[PDB]
Amino acid sequence: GIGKYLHSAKKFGKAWVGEIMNS
Amino acid sequence: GIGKYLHSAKKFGKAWVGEIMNS
């Protein structure tokens, strides 16, 4: 268990927001 | 190009943070 929120979420966590949070 | 930050990140954005942001 736990193998995306720490290696796939965090990454986008800082990029996805700049995407949605910005657009 | 685009497809995981606005179709997968947000999801974890709320779960991954409650994961790492929680501890």
Short mmCIF file of C-alpha atoms in Angstrom, two decimals:
data_model
loop_
_atom_site.label_atom_id
_atom_site.label_comp_id
_atom_site.label_asym_id
_atom_site.label_seq_id
_atom_site.Cartn_x
_atom_site.Cartn_y
_atom_site.Cartn_z
CA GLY A 1 0.00 0.00 0.00
CA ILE A 2 1.14 3.63 -0.39
CA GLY A 3 3.13 3.81 -3.64
CA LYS A 4 1.71 6.80 -5.53
CA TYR A 5 0.88 9.48 -2.96
CA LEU A 6 4.59 9.55 -2.08
CA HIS A 7 6.11 9.02 -5.54
CA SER A 8 3.39 10.21 -7.93
CA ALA A 9 1.22 12.60 -5.93
CA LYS A 10 3.91 14.76 -4.31
CA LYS A 11 5.46 15.33 -7.76
CA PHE A 12 2.20 16.55 -9.32
CA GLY A 13 1.17 17.91 -5.90
CA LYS A 14 3.56 20.75 -6.75
CA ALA A 15 2.84 20.73 -10.51
CA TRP A 16 -0.86 19.79 -10.78
CA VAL A 17 -1.76 22.73 -8.53
CA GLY A 18 0.24 25.17 -10.69
CA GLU A 19 -1.94 23.67 -13.45
CA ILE A 20 -5.40 23.69 -11.90
CA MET A 21 -4.54 26.15 -9.13
CA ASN A 22 -3.22 28.44 -11.89
CA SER A 23 -5.63 27.56 -14.71
CA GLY B 1 1.48 15.94 -22.00
CA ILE B 2 -1.17 16.96 -19.44
CA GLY B 3 -3.59 14.25 -18.26
CA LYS B 4 -2.32 13.26 -14.80
CA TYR B 5 -2.18 16.66 -13.07
CA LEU B 6 -5.79 17.57 -13.89
CA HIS B 7 -7.10 13.99 -14.03
CA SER B 8 -5.10 12.21 -11.31
CA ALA B 9 -3.02 14.71 -9.32
CA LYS B 10 -5.96 16.60 -7.77
CA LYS B 11 -7.31 13.25 -6.52
CA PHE B 12 -4.05 12.46 -4.70
CA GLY B 13 -3.74 16.23 -4.14
CA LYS B 14 -6.35 15.62 -1.42
CA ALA B 15 -5.19 12.09 -0.47
CA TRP B 16 -1.40 12.37 -0.88
CA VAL B 17 -1.32 15.56 1.22
CA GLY B 18 -3.50 13.99 3.93
CA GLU B 19 -0.86 11.25 3.63
CA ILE B 20 2.45 13.11 3.76
CA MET B 21 0.98 16.39 5.03
CA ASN B 22 -0.55 14.33 7.88
CA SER B 23 2.81 12.84 8.94
#
